[PDB]
Amino acid sequence: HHMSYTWTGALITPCAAEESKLPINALSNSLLRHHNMVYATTSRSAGLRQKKVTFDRLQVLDDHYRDVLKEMKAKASTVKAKLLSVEEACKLTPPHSAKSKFGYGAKDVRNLSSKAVNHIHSVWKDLLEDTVTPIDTTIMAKNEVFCVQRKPARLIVFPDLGVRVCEKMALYDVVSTLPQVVMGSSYGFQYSPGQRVEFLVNTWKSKKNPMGFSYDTRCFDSTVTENDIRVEESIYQCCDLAPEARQAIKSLTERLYIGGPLTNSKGQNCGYRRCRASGVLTTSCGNTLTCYLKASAACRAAKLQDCTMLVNGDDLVVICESAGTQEDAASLRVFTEAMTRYSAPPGDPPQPEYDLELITSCSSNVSVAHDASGKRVYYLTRDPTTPLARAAWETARHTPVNSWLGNIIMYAPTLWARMILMTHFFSILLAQEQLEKALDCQIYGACYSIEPLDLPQIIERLHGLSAFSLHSYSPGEINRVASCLRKLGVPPLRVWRHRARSVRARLLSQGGRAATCGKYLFNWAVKTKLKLTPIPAASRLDLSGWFVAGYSGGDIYH
Ligand SMILES: C[C@@H]1C[C@H](C)CN(C(=O)c2cc(Br)ccc2NC(=O)CCC(=O)O)C1
Ligand code: NI
């Protein structure tokens, strides 16, 4: 058997006390009344996830697969990648990333303390000298917030801190550089949300009769086989690399990436992994390469015409030429059969779509609004259910990752981000005078320390000034927002408009950066608008590294 996991029977254990029910404070009801709709996942449901992720994988590899791989390797050979120093690798480590089993923490790593740096050096030497001994990993249940309809906790699998820094030294430059070179415009993590909409729309516009579909692989990490993971290393090895980097990548593949022993928080042996570790540097890059490889081959197998893929890890969308409605449904059944043969069967079956705004990829869809001139403007949005469940949790609880800040960055142009999220959280931050306190959030899986007072500069830079003037959202978009609010017990959009006028007035009264936030962020709320001009600070905003690559699970801080 080629099983994704084997289990001893030891439980997946928490390392802290876990909350499942929505924490409520005095601010909760101003956002959300249906508190019972909102939950966090815990280790109590881990067993249910273990049944989902444990299965036998079969893989039949044909000539389309090897043809695509050979083309990918040829592009990969043009990549020259650098070895990071220990010091460079250390500054990429999140301030609150899990501490070592070996007497030092993430703060120690970032300060380049001699004890951390000495141990990292010893893990590095061990990797160069030993290419066989499985590396230990911890298995944990993630605590994640959702609206009902309950999901079981996702699992996270990660090596010790010293190993994680070693992954960066060996491979940070590779996973940041290689996928765009190999996949070109198909690599999703190179785009901002607006660069993504322009690619999707331009691609849709370059087909006589466009057809698109998203493809949902059931448990993508568990579908990743030893072959798949060895193929990724052969792709990494195509790069021009230093001899120490080649040996470290070989060693990390053999000892960590291919599989290893699973240990709970209590130190007990839980089992063994033979699939993708969800918490290593190469998770995002490995997943994107494996998904693009299999999908590219599956496109050729199905005889899909003029195929453009967009791939973000395990998230896949294809836009192609329609050969007619019946040949489309048929070609999708063959694409799906090919994918299955390659060990990537679907969860939901793929559906062909003939309207761009109806395809969901990366939990997002294109939509249309109008700028300050009446022009039709395409922008990225999503169903706000999960953004709003998480915002409710963050209303009453301090969390490591402020999802609301990251959702405002990613979805600033949206009706729901501007009306609810900006209104709610600027109002909370005004009341606490915490406007200039930097908060952690994540974009494409990497962690960023961000001042909420810098939001005007940031939004202009990523989305343009039009994000501050959009209006006349589509009916379907308005109805999905309004309907989500009713479900969660959120006050309707008229209440938020009334609240934003208050919040705006309050911000301008602070002067300076707060006034800029009031001026730019809430101009949609007043009838007598202000003159919104390019912000000098935005020009100078150092936004390098932001949408280059994906590092979900990769333990990255910028
Ligand atoms: C769909 C919302 C319903 C709410 C009651 C009012 N309303 C807004 O205040 C609004 C919010 C943002 Br953010 C941007 C524009 C808004 N107003 C409009 O789109 C009004 C119609 C228009 O200008 O075409 C729109
Ligand atoms: Ni061939």
Curated annotation (Swiss-Prot):
It catalyses: RNA(n) + a ribonucleoside 5'-triphosphate = RNA(n+1) + diphosphate. Binds 2 magnesium ion that constitute a dinuclear catalytic metal center. It is a single-pass type IV membrane protein. The N-terminus is phosphorylated by host PRK2/PKN2. Its cofactor is Mg(2+). Activity is up-regulated by PRK2/PKN2-mediated phosphorylation. Mg(2+) 2 binds at D216, D314, D315. Changing G313 to A/C: Almost complete loss of RdRp activity. The modification Phosphoserine is found at S30, S43. It is found in: Host cytoplasm; Host endoplasmic reticulum membrane. Residues 210-328 form the RdRp catalytic domain. Homooligomer. Interacts with non-structural protein 5A. Interacts with host VAPB. Interacts with host PRK2/PKN2. Interacts with host HNRNPA1 and SEPT6; these interactions facilitate the viral replication. Part of the replication complex composed of NS2, NS3, NS4A, NS4B, NS5A and the RNA-directed RNA polymerase embedded in an ER-derived membranous web. RNA-dependent RNA polymerase that performs primer-template recognition and RNA synthesis during viral replication. Initiates RNA transcription/replication at a flavin adenine dinucleotide (FAD), resulting in a 5'- FAD cap on viral RNAs. In this way, recognition of viral 5' RNA by host pattern recognition receptors can be bypassed, thereby evading activation of antiviral pathways. This is RNA-directed RNA polymerase.
